[PDB]
Amino acid sequence: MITDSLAVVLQRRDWENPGVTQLNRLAAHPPFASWRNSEEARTDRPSQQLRSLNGEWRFAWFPAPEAVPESWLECDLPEADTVVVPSNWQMHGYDAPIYTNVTYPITVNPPFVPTENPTGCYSLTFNVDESWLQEGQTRIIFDGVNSAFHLWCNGRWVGYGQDSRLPSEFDLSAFLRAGENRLAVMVLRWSDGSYLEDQDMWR
Amino acid sequence: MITDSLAVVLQRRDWENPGVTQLNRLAAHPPFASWRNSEEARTDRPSQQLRSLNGEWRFAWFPAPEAVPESWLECDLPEADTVVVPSNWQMHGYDAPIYTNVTYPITVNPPFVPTENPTGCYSLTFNVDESWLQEGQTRIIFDGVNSAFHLWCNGRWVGYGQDSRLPSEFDLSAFLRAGENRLAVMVLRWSDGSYLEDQDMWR
Ligand SMILES: [Mg+2]
Ligand SMILES: [Mg+2]
């Protein structure tokens, strides 16, 4: 259903545009860990409230963002392999890593980016405890992403994140439903933001 | 045709969001007037290249942005009156002017704005000389707009502008066609940007 559908969401494209770093992303804060017990915070014991999406992750790879199927958001593709996260897909060998000391690997036409950009979509299915849904606000957190990603929850568009190094937080409280909730994430190797960092390291 | 259609374009809404001032808007520059002749620039004689969209303008008024018809972009509404531009619609008396010295007239919940915001849509039909289309780049310019507007050319979405006081330039070269071209502009009284200016003057 539009505008949740990929074609509407993809264009106008955000990543090509210099101006919008992210859409629907909560302001950055030092991590608190959200633990109700006073002792735990002083103790520093791992918080019950905090949850990890880390684990085996469904993965799909496409040459271009246009290429990836619209249908996927509703369901994970049958073909796609499961890849551990956090991971670098190039490390997996789906795409060869590219290293350049000074030059951006992509041709330099800011803010425009190469028409075909390797895109990997990660779909995660997890179950949220009933207690969480009833009260409070639940926000997904990504420690790092590159270059830029589009976030879909339960087949519904959630957010756009423009910076790989920084953590991005989106609120899933509306999206979440009792029982398992599918998570769909789309990552593009090359972003409008990509121009900002030309630092030389394996990319 | 999506995403040109109003429902897709309207949401996600830009005006509610603090972050995006504008979409597809050319960078501000001191006016040049674009005149080929050397003498004219020294002379300061009004430029042939410069064109004025000023004149009688078709006008439509709706209580909310959702309210305004999708169909209009393709064609001007039969009912709507013709109003001189530049003009303030409240001056026309469609909507009573609201004045507040300190308080924003709208309830203060940044960045969110009142669900019904008076919206006026201006449609202008003009003919572009054939010579213009063949070579060069043609960009529409607005000296001022308030609070924020969505720009459609030839039934096709062009740009979003977030600042009323500043001039906003959009490039119409792709959109323009030989013969008359319809112009559709949508203006909203209350914008996310509205919060930025609380200066006290008749609004
Ligand atoms: Mg360097
Ligand atoms: Mg004041």
Swiss-Prot record, chains A, B:
Documented effect of changing D200F: Obliterates all binding and catalysis
Effect of D200 to E/N: Causes a significant decrease in binding affinity in the absence of monovalent cations or in the presence of potassium ions, but only a moderate decrease in the presence of sodium ions
Positions with a binding annotation for Na(+): D200
Induction: By allolactose.
List of residues binding substrate: N101, D200
Assembly description: Homotetramer.
Protein family membership: Belongs to the glycosyl hydrolase 2 family.
Identification of the protein by name: Beta-galactosidase
Lineage: Bacteria, Pseudomonadati, Pseudomonadota, Gammaproteobacteria, Enterobacterales
